[PDB]
């Protein structure tokens, strides 16, 4: 169970094999490995991973230029891969060879407060025959007198945007070290050029 950090780019459909393949690309790039975490003084087995270098005056103080190996911080700071004990050096991309399937975590873009239809999903209805009053509306909620309450978590209108998701079982068919890219079955959550970690998938182990 390994991993690599990444920023999103590309999406197409490259005519690999002979068939078409939706190609989501990610720049894993030079994503540091700066500090491990052992059982007794932590409680797991994880590592911290940086990203893109631009950091001078706006950062300073502890840096972890301390840590035990400096290297300065990225600008997109660092995250954490559990159950991963690397070899040492800042890990690039080739961690995953083409031909394997993987998991991937990243923030979903923001759609904010939405209408229940475009949220969970309800129905609405009466566009004509009925009334114009309750178009994009939830209609009802709870039962009459008993419970006489509104169910805990009974799906309701509200936020559906600035969240985060992990997708499983995507397939990478390329990886270019020459500029640090990763070419996978297109399903990439989030917008073009943001936060996204890759980790090994799960099937039977």
């Amino acid at each position: 169970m390994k991993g690599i950090l990444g920023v999103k780019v590309g999406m197409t459909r490259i005519f690999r094999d002979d068939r078409a393949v939706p190609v989501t690309v990610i720049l894993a790039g030079p994503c540091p490995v700066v500090q491990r975490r052992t059982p007794e003084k932590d409680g797991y087995t994880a590592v911290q991973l940086g990203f893109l270098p631009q950091n001078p005056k706006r950062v300073n103080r502890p840096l972890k230029g301390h840590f035990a190996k400096a290297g300065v911080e990225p600008v997109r700071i660092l995250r954490e891969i559990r159950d991963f004990n690397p070899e040492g050096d800042t890990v690039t991309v080739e961690i995953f060879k083409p031909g394997e399937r993987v998991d991937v975590t990243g923030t979903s873009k923001g759609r904010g407060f939405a209408g229940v239809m475009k949220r969970w999903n309800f129905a609405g209805g009466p566009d004509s025959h009925g009334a114009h009053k309750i178009h994009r509306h939830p209609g009802s909620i709870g039962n009459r007198k008993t419970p006489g309450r509104v169910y805990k978590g009974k799906k309701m209108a509200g936020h559906y945007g600035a969240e985060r998701v992990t997708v499983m079982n995507l397939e990478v068919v390329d990886v270019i070290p020459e500029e640090n890219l990763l070419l996978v079955k297109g399903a990439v959550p989030g917008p073009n050029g943001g936060l996204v970690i890759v980790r090994e998938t799960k099937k039977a182990a």
Binding site: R13, F15, A20
Partner: protein, 122 residues
């Protein structure tokens, strides 16, 4: 997108010419069909001296539609209509007189009879 309440025309000798879409054979919720798809049909328009009569209820398979389908290599294809072909309760093309371009999608499905006489296979 093929759904019930849809007028289809036949492209063969049959004994008919225009049929109405009734249900689909797929999973009991698959209210959608397309190329190489199994359809139940209520006949609505036929040619007098024929076999299948005006109002018959038989089965069918789609060859041609107004919503093209994508072939996995990314190259789609559309025949401007809703043409199907009568099949029976035994998975068999009733008539013998195929009309116009069909789809090789059907070929992979198990309608080798079509593709055969079928003039412009695409």
């Amino acid at each position: 997108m093929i759904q019930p309440q849809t007028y289809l025309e036949v492209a063969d000798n049959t004994g008919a010419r225009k049929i109405m879409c009734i249900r689909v054979l797929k999973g009991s919720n698959a209210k959608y069909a397309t190329v190489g798809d199994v359809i139940v049909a209520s006949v609505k328009e036929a040619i007098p001296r024929g076999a299948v009569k005006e109002g018959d209820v038989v089965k069918a398979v789609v060859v041609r539609t107004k919503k093209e389908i994508k072939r996995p290599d990314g190259s789609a294809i559309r025949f401007d209509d809703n043409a199907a072909v009568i099949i029976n309760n035994q998975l068999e093309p009733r008539g013998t007189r195929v009309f116009g371009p069909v789809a090789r999608e059907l070929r992979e499905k198990g309608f080798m009879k079509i593709v055969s006489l079928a003039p412009e296979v695409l």
